[PDB]
Design an enzyme around this catalytic site. Structure first.
Site, PDB file in Angstrom:
ATOM      1  CE  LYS A  85      -3.404   2.168   3.133  1.00  0.00           C
ATOM      2  NZ  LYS A  85      -4.458   1.872   4.140  1.00  0.00           N
TER       3      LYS A  85
ATOM      4  CE  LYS B 219      -0.311   5.604   5.736  1.00  0.00           C
ATOM      5  NZ  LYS B 219      -0.088   6.172   7.101  1.00  0.00           N
TER       6      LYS B 219
ATOM      7  CD  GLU C 163      -7.470   2.670   2.454  1.00  0.00           C
ATOM      8  OE1 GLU C 163      -6.495   1.991   2.059  1.00  0.00           O
ATOM      9  OE2 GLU C 163      -7.721   2.856   3.664  1.00  0.00           O
TER      10      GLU C 163
ATOM     11  CG  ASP D 161     -10.073   4.151   5.944  1.00  0.00           C
ATOM     12  OD1 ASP D 161     -10.754   3.819   6.940  1.00  0.00           O
ATOM     13  OD2 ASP D 161      -8.854   4.418   6.022  1.00  0.00           O
TER      14      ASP D 161
HETATM   15 MG   LIG Z   1      -7.191   4.513   4.648  1.00  0.00          MG
END
Ligand SMILES: [Mg+2]
Ligand SMILES: [Mg+2]
Lengths: 361, 361
Positions: free
Chosen positions: B155, B157, B212, B237
């Protein structure tokens, strides 16, 4: 030598009423613990695609083989194992899960309500269906149940007769009872939207508190439209045949109240997921029944005891229609409620003699 | 002299990372059984309205008084008792329920996963966030985790830097790893829809498997529109701050995948209701984290073990970021998964010495 499922026996029982057919499930584990479940419906195939006969067929031929040998203590795994190979058959699945819950409750020494998370109440209000078809008789029976402090919420089944006659019938009953009772109707999908759009306005303007499934579950757009035109809340019953239906109905805005029936969702656990969806959508809850005997009624009750709120009460009066059940001790009804004990599992035992006498074979 | 809740102690702990603050909950019952829970968040108030400091304040001042003296064995009743008097504070509620579940698990001699219905798996795939901010470093670290068979899902960011630079960064990482790994991104609400509508198309056309929370949870209509224009699935989320949000998001069509975080829903049980709503809507599931230590991570894991399917895996790597935890035995990570034992409760014990050393006070 403990939790492994050893056998699953399905028994069709015919009981006289004030005849009702029940499908009893006897699930036995390697440690000797037996769980009891119930898969019951109404009128053969007139109220669902599963008959007591086909429920026994499918459980014996497909469900049993999948579960014999499996760990009865892991109910989630067992029911998902079933869901992987079996489409529909929710009535059968409901009976099976009830049996597993009863057994696990006995195994842990906890009532089913606790296995499901914990009760927030010990009693559930129970409505009563007035089915004489005669206005005078229904009013008298209602007043009788009120005097005996047995029921104060009444349900009238309509839709089979001429619309205006059915409406007059229900309205006359409410008028006679006044604020001493809550009067609701169940149309069982009988009306076309063309009729319901007018009838709902009349019932709502005349003291009827709830209109259950006025039109066909197939008229999806129509149910949404009726929610807007009806001054009385509409409850979905037949429209819910699985948990997913609950979500879709809430998404569309097809009803402001959902009937919760373990038989239609596939057991107490599936029913609680349907309840979770309804609650998250701001939809009211009602404890429904398919006229189950004591076993199915208590399996439903234990799930309902865990709900934060049951705004529209319940119709768990199935056992009250039987002149005789197969249980040694029937459920407890007193002061407008069904009182659920804290006994392990479903807290009921089979009366072997009566079972042997009423079992079809 | 048994299940009554005797005391609830909240402890703020600061742990060094490869600093992370945890809020440990120690719940003790009259029968001597102790349950442990964890309420942890990220960066003070930058990622939620509850800080470790205010979580301790509200639990001590409002939650504790409501639960001391209550039967710890009825978790549903205890949590509803909280819901009746406490709005929000889901992080605090999550820690409390985790503690109750751990205690009840110990009390019955069953793992939390069983209290929740039963596991269908013993291991959970665990993704890994690459946070060096350097493309070369991230690729090297990813290849390292692959070689050690620790992680194969990564993942990234993004959203803080210039859009095209963030996109180039992520795309270069996926290009280097090829089909050896799954690469996803988390924008943490950073983009405006104007930017996301173009960026999602670029990421989707370049091997990024999931996007996300690309935009603000406040742009409700925008999230729905992006689901239609993005060739890559969008995961919600931050948009989920309670179970009801899950229903509304599913109703609107705001995301095709939901992250499941016990802290955001109010505990493992509430999280499973959110999961039930998602499943009923055909929405995929992902096991999310707020970077909890072992306690919170396992509380989440036990709930996730009961899910029929977790199509998008999990990010339960919180414990792996701590150079030291307050647990005697850390969670088990091996071959791309977190392995959850069948020990009673959450199956973990407190290392009193390390707790005394790291507790803020
Ligand atoms: Mg998140
Ligand atoms: Mg009905």
């Amino acid at each position: 030598h403990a939790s492994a499922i050893e056998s699953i026996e399905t028994i069709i029982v015919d009981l006289p009423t004030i005849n009702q057919t029940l499908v009893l499930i006897r699930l036995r584990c390697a440690d000797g613990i037996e769980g009891l479940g119930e898969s019951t419906t109404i009128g053969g195939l007139a109220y669902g695609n599963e008959s007591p006969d086909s429920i026994k067929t499918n459980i014996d031929r497909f469900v049993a083989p999948l579960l014999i040998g499996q760990d009865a203590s892991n109910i989630n795994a067992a029911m998902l194992r079933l869901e992987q190979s079996i489409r529909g058959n929710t009535f059968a699945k409901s009976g099976i899960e009830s049996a597993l819950l009863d057994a696990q409750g006995k195994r842990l020494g906890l009532p089913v309500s606790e296995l499901l998370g914990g009760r927030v109440r010990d009693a559930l209000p129970v409505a009563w269906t007035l089915a004489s078809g005669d206005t005078a008789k229904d009013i008298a029976e209602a007043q009788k149940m009120l005097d005996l402090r047995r029921h104060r919420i009444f349900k009238l089944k309509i839709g089979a007769g001429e619309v205006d006659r059915d409406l007059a019938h229900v309205i006359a009953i409410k008028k006679a009872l006044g604020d001493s009772a809550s009067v609701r109707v169940d149309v069982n999908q009988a009306w076309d939207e063309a009729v319901a759009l007018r009838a709902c306005r009349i019932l709502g303007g005349n003291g009827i508190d709830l209109i259950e499934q006025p039109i066909s579950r197939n008229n999806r757009a129509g149910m949404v439209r009726l929610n807007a035109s009806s001054p009385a809340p509409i409850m979905a019953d037949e429209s819910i045949e699985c948990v997913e239906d609950a979500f879709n109905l809430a998404r569309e805005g097809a009803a402001s109240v959902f009937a919760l029936k373990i038989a239609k969702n596939g057991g107490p656990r599936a029913t609680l997921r349907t309840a979770a969806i309804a609650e998250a959508a701001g939809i009211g809850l009602y404890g429904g029944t398919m006229l189950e005997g004591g076993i199915g009624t208590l399996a439903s009750a234990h799930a309902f005891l865990t709900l934060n709120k049951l705004s529209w009460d319940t119709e768990l009066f199935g056992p009250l229609l039987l002149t005789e059940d197969i249980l040694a001790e029937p459920p407890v009804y007193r002061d407008f409620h069904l009182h659920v004990s804290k006994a392990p599992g479903l807290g009921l035992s089979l009366d072997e003699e009566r079972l042997a006498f009423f079992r079809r074979e």
